[PDB]
Design a protein around this ligand. Sequence first.
Ligand SMILES: Cc1cn(C)nc1Nc1ccc2scc(-c3ccncc3)c2n1
Ligand code: NI
Length: 320
Amino acid sequence: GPVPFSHCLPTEKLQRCEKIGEGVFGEVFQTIADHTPVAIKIIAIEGQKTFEEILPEIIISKELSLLSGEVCNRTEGFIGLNSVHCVQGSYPPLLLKAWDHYNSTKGSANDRPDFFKDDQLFIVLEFEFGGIDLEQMRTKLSSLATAKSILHQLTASLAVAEASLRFEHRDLHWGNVLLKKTSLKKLHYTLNGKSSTIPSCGLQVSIIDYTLSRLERDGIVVFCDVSMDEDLFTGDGDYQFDIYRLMKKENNNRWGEYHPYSNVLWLHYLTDKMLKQMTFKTKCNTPAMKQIKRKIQEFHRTMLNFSSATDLLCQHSLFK
Ligand SMILES: Cc1cn(C)nc1Nc1ccc2scc(-c3ccncc3)c2n1
Ligand code: NI
């Protein structure tokens, strides 16, 4: 059967819940469990999305989480999934209070979740805490060396997911790139059996929000069908909203197919943001840093001629 909210969110864990984010159908809370930070996503089911509409996110979250402990195709560059629960009950008042605090400070585009009755079902996905998004870190990164590390981590992570699962993220905006301190000097990945390293520059990247993502295992495709969605393809003001139109154009509005080019489009959007909307604490006023800047500029202007993240990682001069 379903379980009460208290099964997932015992008193002390619930007391420490703060809202950190949201989606069109979701609320994300940060908390502590057994002295360990976690990120909780809570999605209402039936009644808003159906179970069938939520399952893809569950499967994808699961498959990408598994890549951290595989061998031939291995990456930590997406986020650990600790557990999945189907919960029944009205929204916990302590969660409402945390919800309100976020509405008062940042503003929510969601409905205050106070209208749910005690037979309401929810899917509660509990993840490792991945850190703070790249947008919030717009002014806080240290140098363009860091920016290069970040792009290399993203590119590799997508490459491995391409090789393993024929993955497309399909919404990798700078809000979905998390950063977290690591004392590791070098990060490791393995692509089709070949291991390599990336200088961390003190950070570990984690990719999130598989809400539009696509993959497959054994000829079964798991995805979000947005072919009858109109609103997604009629935004602007940011280069983000062009990617949605480019994907739709590249794939002829058939979202089951595999088009890893879409990973390249999103990495280009992120390289653009690195070059145009970030301010680094150290400026590129040394020969070595100017050089790094030039190579990122050269990546920006050439990467769109690569067919996938795999192609970029193996072949692009930025990573050699
Ligand atoms: C929870 C989660 C996991 N996946 C695969 N996707 C998710 N979705 C979102 C949506 C919004 C935000 S705003 C901060 C987060 C976040 C922060 C830290 N650690 C994970 C997620 C977030 N996550
Ligand atoms: Ni349980």
